[PDB]
Amino acid sequence: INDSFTEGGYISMFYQTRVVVPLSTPRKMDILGFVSACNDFSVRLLRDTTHISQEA
């Protein structure tokens, strides 16, 4: 959960130099982001998620 004592940190992305393209090339491009865990990752204390709910 969003918690101050156990806050994780900050990921950020910056231009190191810049994106350079020649002529007759799209000047705007897209990057896609992916995340995953490493082999040292682990969880515990199984609980109920807040991403699914039911009505009535």
Partner 1 sequence: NYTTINYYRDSASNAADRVMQLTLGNSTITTQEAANSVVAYGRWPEYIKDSEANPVDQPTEPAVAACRFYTLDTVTWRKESRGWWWKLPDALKDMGLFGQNMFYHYLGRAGYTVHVQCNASKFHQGALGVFAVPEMCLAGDSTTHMFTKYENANPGEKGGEFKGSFTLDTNATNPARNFCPVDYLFGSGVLAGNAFVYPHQIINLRTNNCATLVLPYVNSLSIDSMTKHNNWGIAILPLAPLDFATESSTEIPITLTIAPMCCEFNGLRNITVPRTQ
Partner 2 sequence: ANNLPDTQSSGPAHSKETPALTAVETGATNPLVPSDTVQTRHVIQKRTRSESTVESFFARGACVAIIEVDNDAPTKRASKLFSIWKITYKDTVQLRRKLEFFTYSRFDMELTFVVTSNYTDANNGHALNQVYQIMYIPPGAPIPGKWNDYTWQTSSNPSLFYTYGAPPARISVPYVGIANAYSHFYDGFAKVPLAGQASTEGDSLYGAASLNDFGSLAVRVVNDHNPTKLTSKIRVYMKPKHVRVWCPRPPRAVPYYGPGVDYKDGLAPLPEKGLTTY
* Contacting positions for partner 1 (CB under 8 A): 9, 17, 20, 22, 24-30, 32, 34
Work out the end-to-end distance of the chain between its first and last CA atoms, rounded to an integer number of angstroms. Answer: 27
C-alpha atoms less than 13 angstroms from C-alpha of 40 in its C-beta half-sphere: 0
Among 17, 22, 27, 34, binds partner 2 (CB under 8 A): 34
Nearer to partner 2, 9 or 23 (CB): 9
Q: Are 19 and 29 in contact (CB under 8 A)?
A: yes
Rounded CA separation 18/27 (Å)? 12
Does position 53 bind partner 2 by CB under 8 A? yes
Q: Which residues bind partner 2 (CB under 8 A)?
A: 1, 3-7, 10, 12, 34, 36, 38-56
